Ligand binder design. Structure first.
Ligand code: MG
Length: 196
RNA sequence: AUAGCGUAUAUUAAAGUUGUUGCAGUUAAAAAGCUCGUAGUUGAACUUCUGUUCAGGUUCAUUUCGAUUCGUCGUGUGAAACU
């Protein structure tokens, strides 16, 4: 539907499927009705995960308007499950973040809130992708020359949902951001006082 | 030392013997008996990171090319970084 979009002009074959696909789920499943009623879309981008295997395995990332970001996270799990079943493609939800300029300030009486800065915006997606579960440890490495590798620590109990998307994420990030992102699984680090 | 050479006095260096650079401070001189406290001096971390490609030189490297000589240029790569 052009309904579930903000620009409301024209959609792309991908964006279109996503629209009806969404409208589908709120009619089909009674539970996602409430949440999906709310959800609006900003834009959707498709990315090809090209591996040396000459295999074409694509997935698509969808930009949920910030207004519905709360809601999007509220049912995030179930939503992505159905969208992947109903589109046979890998699905990722992000927030539509607007980045502010560093030196291009123009409104004398306007300060650039850190909330919308490049470090913080680009760092956002990573949380968004692995979505269902947020990371435990994040790190940076400086290869001699000057590369920066982000080996990120992911929870063990989530090996399911995250192991698969794992390659897509890497590839979407390298495209949007510019950051190489390798992951590493570590058993969760429960630190409490076991007391028998 | 030598048509020059002593002497007296102030002053420079030796003086890291007045010290920003660059001193010392248990016992050699030197931490105050001890706390509060405005001047003064001193202050944590975040905000385009980054990538791709083109180009100009720069350098450096060279199982290497063309020129010249009593030591330079041009060409190619890679690389870095600049721009
Ligand atoms: Mg004498």
């Amino acid at each position: 539907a052009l309904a579930k979009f903000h620009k409301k002009q024209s959609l792309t074959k991908i964006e279109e499927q996503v629209g009806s696909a969404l409208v589908e789920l709120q009619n089909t499943h009674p539970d996602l009705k409430t949440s999906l009623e709310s959800i609006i879309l900003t834009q959707v981008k498709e990315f090809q995960i090209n591996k040396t295997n000459k295999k074409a395995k694509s997935a698509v990332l969808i930009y949920v308007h910030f207004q519905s970001y709360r809601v999007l996270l509220s049912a995030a799990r179930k939503l992505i499950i159905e969208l992947e079943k109903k589109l046979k493609q890998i699905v990722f939800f992000t927030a539509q973040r607007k980045i502010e300029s560093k030196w291009v300030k123009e409104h004398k009486s306007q300060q650039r809130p850190r909330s919308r800065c490049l470090t913080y915006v680009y760092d956002a997606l990573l949380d968004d992708l692995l979505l269902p579960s947020t990371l435990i440890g994040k790190r940076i490495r400086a290869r001699l020359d000057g590369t920066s590798f982000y080996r990120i620590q992911l929870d063990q109990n989530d090996r399911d949902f995250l192991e698969e998307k794992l390659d897509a994420i890497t590839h979407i990030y390298k495209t949007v951001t510019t950051r190489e992102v390798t992951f590493e699984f570590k058993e969760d680090k429960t630190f409490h006082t076991f007391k028998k």
